[PDB]
Design goal:
monomer, 126 residues, mainly alpha, Rho guanine nucleotide exchange factor 7
């Protein structure tokens, strides 16, 4: 096995995001190795709550109201909508549709939004 330590693999767009959510204290630490990083993200972010904490750890006081326990469909969509609220208004970055995350349609857009959220906050120099 010829490991060439000059050219090593790099953590993918999803891997950095998972770790990013954990260090910000908005997502819990996994009990195992994450086989599906993007899938794990979608299932965890589906209810919006994690994204609400995410935005409140970067822009503290942007989420007007979050449902820590969303019973109704519109409640989950509202939590995601609050995330889109701040990221679309204050930051004005790559936004997506609540249906993409909640119904697991186009996660590629959701991940792009998360990565961009890291890009803009890095640009601030946090």
């Amino acid at each position: 096995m010829g490991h060439h330590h000059h050219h090593h693999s790099h953590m993918n767009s999803a891997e950095q995001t998972v770790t990013w959510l954990i260090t910000l204290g908005v997502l819990e630490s996994p009990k195992k190795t994450i086989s599906d990083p993007e899938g794990f993200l979608q299932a965890s972010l589906k209810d919006g709550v994690v994204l609400c904490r995410l935005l409140e750890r970067l822009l503290p006081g942007t989420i007007e109201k979050v449902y820590p326990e969303p019973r109704s469909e519109s409640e989950c969509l509202s939590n995601i909508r609050e995330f889109l609220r701040g990221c679309g208004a204050s930051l004005r970055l790559e936004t997506f549709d609540a249906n993409d995350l909640y119904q697991g349609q186009n996660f590629n857009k959701v991940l792009s939004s998360l990565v961009t959220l890291n890009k803009v906050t890095a640009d601030i120099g946090l």
